[PDB]
Amino acid sequence: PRRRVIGQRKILPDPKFGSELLAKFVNILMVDGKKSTAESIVYSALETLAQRSGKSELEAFEVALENVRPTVEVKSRRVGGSTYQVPVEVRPVRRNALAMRWIVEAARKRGDKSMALRLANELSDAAENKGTAVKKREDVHRMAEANKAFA
Amino acid sequence: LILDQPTNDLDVETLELLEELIDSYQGTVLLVSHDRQFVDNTVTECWIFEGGGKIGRYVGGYHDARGQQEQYVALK
Amino acid sequence: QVEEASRSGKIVFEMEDVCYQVNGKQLVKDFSAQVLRGDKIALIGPNGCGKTTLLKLMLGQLQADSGRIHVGTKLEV
Amino acid sequence: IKVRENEPFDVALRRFKRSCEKAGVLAEVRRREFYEKPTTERKRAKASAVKRHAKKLARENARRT
Amino acid sequence: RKQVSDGVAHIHASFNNTIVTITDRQGNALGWATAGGSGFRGSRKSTPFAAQVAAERCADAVKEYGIKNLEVMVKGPGPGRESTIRALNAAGFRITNITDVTPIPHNGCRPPKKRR
RNA sequence: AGUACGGCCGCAAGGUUAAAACUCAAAUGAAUUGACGGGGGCCCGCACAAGCGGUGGAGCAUGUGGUUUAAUUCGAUGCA
Ligand SMILES: Nc1ncnc2c1ncn2[C@@H]1O[C@H](COP(=O)(O)OP(=O)(O)OP(=O)(O)O)[C@@H](O)[C@H]1O
Ligand SMILES: [Mg+2]
Ligand SMILES: [Mg+2]
Ligand SMILES: [Mg+2]
Ligand SMILES: [Mg+2]
Ligand SMILES: [Mg+2]
Ligand SMILES: [Mg+2]
Numbered sequence: 040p041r042r043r044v045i046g047q048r049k050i051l052p053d054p055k056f057g058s059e060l061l062a063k064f065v066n067i068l069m070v071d072g073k074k075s076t077a078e079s080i081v082y083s084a085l086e087t088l089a090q091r092s093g094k095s096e097l098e099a100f101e102v103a104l105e106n107v108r109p110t111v112e113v114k115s116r117r118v119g120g121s122t123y124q125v126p127v128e129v130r131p132v133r134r135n136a137l138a139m140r141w142i143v144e145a146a147r148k149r150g151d152k153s154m155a156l157r158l159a160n161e162l163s164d165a166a167e168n169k170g171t172a173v174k175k176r177e178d179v180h181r182m183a184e185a186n187k188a189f190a
Numbered sequence: 191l192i193l194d195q196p197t198n199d200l201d202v203e204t205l206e207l208l209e210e211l212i213d214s215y216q217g218t219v220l221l222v223s224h225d226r227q228f229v230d231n232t233v234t235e236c237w238i239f240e241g242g243g244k245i246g247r248y249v250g251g252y253h254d255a256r257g258q259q260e261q262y263v264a265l266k
Numbered sequence: 267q268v269e270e271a272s273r274s275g276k277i278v279f280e281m282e283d284v285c286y287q288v289n290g291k292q293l294v295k296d297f298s299a300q301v302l303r304g305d306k307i308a309l310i311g312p313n314g315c316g317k318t319t320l321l322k323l324m325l326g327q328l329q330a331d332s333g334r335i336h337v338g339t340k341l342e343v
Numbered sequence: 344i345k346v347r348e349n350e351p352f353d354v355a356l357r358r359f360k361r362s363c364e365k366a367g368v369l370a371e372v373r374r375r376e377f378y379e380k381p382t383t384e385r386k387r388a389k390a391s392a393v394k395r396h397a398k399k400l401a402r403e404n405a406r407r408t
Numbered sequence: 409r410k411q412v413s414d415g416v417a418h419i420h421a422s423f424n425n426t427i428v429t430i431t432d433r434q435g436n437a438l439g440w441a442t443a444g445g446s447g448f449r450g451s452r453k454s455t456p457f458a459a460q461v462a463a464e465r466c467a468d469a470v471k472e473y474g475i476k477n478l479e480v481m482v483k484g485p486g487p488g489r490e491s492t493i494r495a496l497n498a499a500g501f502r503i504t505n506i507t508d509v510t511p512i513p514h515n516g517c518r519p520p521k522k523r524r
Numbered sequence: 525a526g527u528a529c530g531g532c533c534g535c536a537a538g539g540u541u542a543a544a545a546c547u548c549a550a551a552u553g554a555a556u557u558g559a560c561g562g563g564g565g566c567c568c569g570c571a572c573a574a575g576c577g578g579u580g581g582a583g584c585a586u587g588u589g590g591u592u593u594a595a596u597u598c599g600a601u602g603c604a
């Protein structure tokens with residue numbers, strides 16, 4: 040994308056809840072283009088989060104997400120032979136793109152049982168600032184502060 | 191490996207090697223220790239004990255796990 | 267130097283619904299956790315809170331009051 | 344160089360050092376010598392300046408903008 | 409101790425480091441802080457943010473004297489040339505007059521050779 | 525080869541004067557069209573960056589190299 044600029048691509052909303060937020064989350068963990076299966080998993084994983092939390096469907100999905108989305112993240116920015124990295128603030132629309140990713144990646148580890156179960160554990164951990172997904176944020180959050188000299 | 195305070199009487203020179211040995215160990219390791227510096231170089235998770243038979247499992251070394259334990263909100 | 271052996275089963279310890287309590291106070295109340303291969307775990311807490319007895323449950327030294335514990339399959343403890 | 348700053352200022356804005364003493368003065372003193380690369384520099388550093396007067400006089404052209 | 413009212417801030421900004429030292433009127437030091445000692449060992453200490461933290465720490469460890477009024481004397485061209493003096497303002501010091509005391513010979517001693 | 529020998533000069537470093545045999549069919553100067561630069565501007569593109577999924581390990585299918593064989597027919601050998 041040197042000359043080009045790209046506006047956006049439209050996404051179908053989630054069927055139970057007319058929110059585009061839960062619609063992209065289904066896409067991220069969907070593999071081999073199997074949208075039905077990944078949609079079942081998210082529904083079998085957020086059904087329990089209503090049971091545990093008290094918040095029902097999206098305030099419960101938001102609250103777990105909100106403790107995982109970052110504020111800054113770094114990149115390699117060599118100048119003329121340098122090799123260091125520069126912390127750069129991230130736009131509000133890439134936050135959820137990174138936040139959902141980290142949850143699903145950490146869910147594929149920690150193998151307990153069916154994905155609908157081990158994802159349910161990871162989502163509930165992020166509702167408490169407890170799981171791996173939060174640690175991945177703080178690991179980035181430290182490295183962005185340890186290199187704060189570059190800005 | 192199960193270690194109930196493996197570094198009680200060891201000096202730091204011998205303890206330094208044990209930190210490197212246990213770190214590189216490929217297999218499973220469950221270790222118990224009451225000091226701070228030693229668990230920041232060998233372990234990546236904690237099972238922090240609480241009263242009433244409740245165990246809270248946090249992620250990271252000692253200091254990282256205690257960090258999540260300040261910010262706990264316990265899923266209202 | 268350590269003596270590495272063949273890789274253990276992917277599940278080392280699995281215990282769910284396990285709740286063991288000494289006469290007076292509860293040491294472990296409705297535990298549910300898993301220990302996978304190559305996972306390094308540190309038990310920490312206060313004095314006399316059951317760290318040494320928790321390992322005893324894992325190796326089957328003393329029997330859990332309830333909940334059942336399943337052990338790994340190619341372990342060399 | 345010195346700024347008394349008077350009573351109300353609330354902000355530095357010390358561009359007063361840019362006149363006179365600054366890293367511009369010290370750069371020539373950081374190192375070097377050679378006693379005649381200055382005469383290579385000062386000959387180049389003004390041969391170019393007059394060559395810009397030729398290009399500045401080269402505005403007598405349509406150039407159609 | 410000695411509850412000195414008015415002091416002077418010396419900043420030795422350099423191409424590699426920046427050393428902040430707070431003194432009274434008559435050249436008696438009271439405390440200091442550098443970029444390197446503030447956890448910036450390596451190539452990071454040559455950046456104005458590291459210079460900010462050096463004056464952040466030097467604002468402390470001098471508060472025992474309760475230094476309210478401050479003069480600033482800046483020496484040497486380097487990154488942390490204005491970052492340190494903005495840090496002292498946010499540290500709560502009143503600044504009266506800023507100075508430049510960079511030493512420039514009138515063609516005195518011979519500098520080093522050159523680096524190729 | 526600004527070298528050898530010989531003069532003159534110098535404390536020395538060395539300076540000045542100054543060859544020949546031999547060997548090559550060229551050496552050289554300025555400019556032209558290209559190519560090339562770890563030279564400079566402007567523009568690009570799955571080239572990086574942001575991502576998804578693989579190869580390299582395992583078993584098998586197919587082709588090649590080598591080695592064997594009475595013959596393992598011939599051809600294709602960086603990108604291509
Ligand atoms: N043989 C025993 N008979 C009775 N009570 C026991 C016995 N062994 C341990 N206990 C009790 O069980 C509880 C846990 O003991 P345990 O040995 O597991 O402690 P711990 O958590 O490892 O602590 P510490 O770090 O102090 O050794 C304590 O209340 C202790 O008094
Ligand atoms: Mg030098
Ligand atoms: Mg001669
Ligand atoms: Mg000569
Ligand atoms: Mg001679
Ligand atoms: Mg890439
Ligand atoms: Mg293979």
Ligand SMILES: [Mg+2]
Nearest residue numbers: 597598599600
């Ligand atoms: Mg042929």
Ligand SMILES: [Mg+2]
Nearest residue numbers: 588597598599
């Ligand atoms: Mg062939």
Ligand SMILES: [Mg+2]
Nearest residue numbers: 598599600601
């Ligand atoms: Mg042929």
